[PDB]
Amino acid sequence: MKSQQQAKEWIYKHEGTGVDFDGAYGFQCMDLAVAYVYYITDGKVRMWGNAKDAINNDFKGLATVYENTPSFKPQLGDVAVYTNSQYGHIQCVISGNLDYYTCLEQNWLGGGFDGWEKATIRTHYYDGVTHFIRPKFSASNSNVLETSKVNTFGNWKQNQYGTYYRNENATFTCGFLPIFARVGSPKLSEPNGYWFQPNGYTPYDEVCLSDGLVWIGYNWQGTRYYLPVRQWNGKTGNSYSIGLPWGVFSHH
C-alpha cells in the first residue's frame, strides 16, 4: 500500500497525460481510476467493470466505500463515483469541501475515445457523485509494486523475430473486456485468431514480450495461439515495466 503523499504525486504526474492501460479505446474514465487504484494498492486491487461498478469491487480491506452526504468531506486520494447513469463516471479526488471538490478525470467531455481529451483537473459542485472510495493509505512511502516479481525483468530468450520469450505454466482467466487471440505468433500484424471472451480461461505454457504487449502462448484445438494480457513498455533489463493485467492468473 502506498502513502497519501504518493497518491498526490501520482495524480499530478498524470495530469495532461492519457491513461489507457486497460488497452481499450483511448482514455476512458475508468482507465484512470483502475490505474490509480492499482498503483496505490501496490497491485493488490485490480478494479473490474464500468465506472459505476467500482463501488462493488473487492478492495480486500484496503479501501472503504462511503456514500456522499451533505456532511461528507472528501480527501486527497478518494475515488469519486457517479452511479446514477447507465455506465457511471469516476474521478481521482485532489481536494474538497462541502461546496465543491476538485479531481483528476478522463472522458468528462467524451473525447477519450478519439484521444484529444487527456486526464484533466476539474472542479465539480456535487453534480452527480454518489459515493467516495477512501483508500487506507500507509503512513510511509512504498516501492513494492516497482520491485515486485511482475515489474522485474528476469531471464528471457529472444528469437530471430525480436520476440522475447520464456517458459511459464499457469492459467489465465480473461477479465471484464474480451481480447483477440492471434494465431501462430504474438504479433498485432497477424489477422487470424478468435475473440477470447470475458471469464474464459486457458492454461498456457509460454510468455512473450512483443509489439508493446506481454502475451501468453498456448494450444487450442491443435492450433498455437498468443493472447496479449497486459501492456509492456518495450524496454528490457532494469528499465522493463509492464502494465496492470487484463485478467487473472492462477495455478493448478
Binding site: G23, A24, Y25, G26, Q28, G49, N50, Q86, Y87, N107, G110, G112, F113, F176, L177, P178, I179, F180, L188, P191, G193, W195, D211, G212, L213, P228, Q231, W246
Partner: protein, 67 residues
C-alpha cells in the same frame, strides 16, 4: 466505410460485437464508440455502419451509426 449487423450487445456491460457484411472477423464494439449521446446502446441484429480500428485488444468499431 464498413457495414454490418450487431451480433450481440450487452447493455449492462456496454459492449458487444458486430458481424461485418464482408464476412471478416467479428469487430468489438464499446459503448464509447457509438455515435450520438442519445444512444450508448445497440440492439441484436441492428444494421450499423462504422470504421474499423485495429487496437492491442483486436479489431474494434469506431463511429458506429444506426442505419
Amino acid at each position: 466505410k464498413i457495414k454490418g449487423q450487431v451480433k450481440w450487445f450487452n447493455e449492462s456491460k456496454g459492449f458487444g460485437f458486430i458481424t461485418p457484411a464482408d464476412g471478416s472477423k467479428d469487430v468489438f464494439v464499446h459503448f464509447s464508440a457509438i455515435q450520438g449521446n442519445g444512444f450508448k446502446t445497440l440492439a441484436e441484429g441492428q444494421n450499423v455502419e462504422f470504421e474499423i480500428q485495429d487496437g492491442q485488444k483486436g479489431p474494434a468499431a469506431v463511429n458506429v451509426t444506426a442505419i
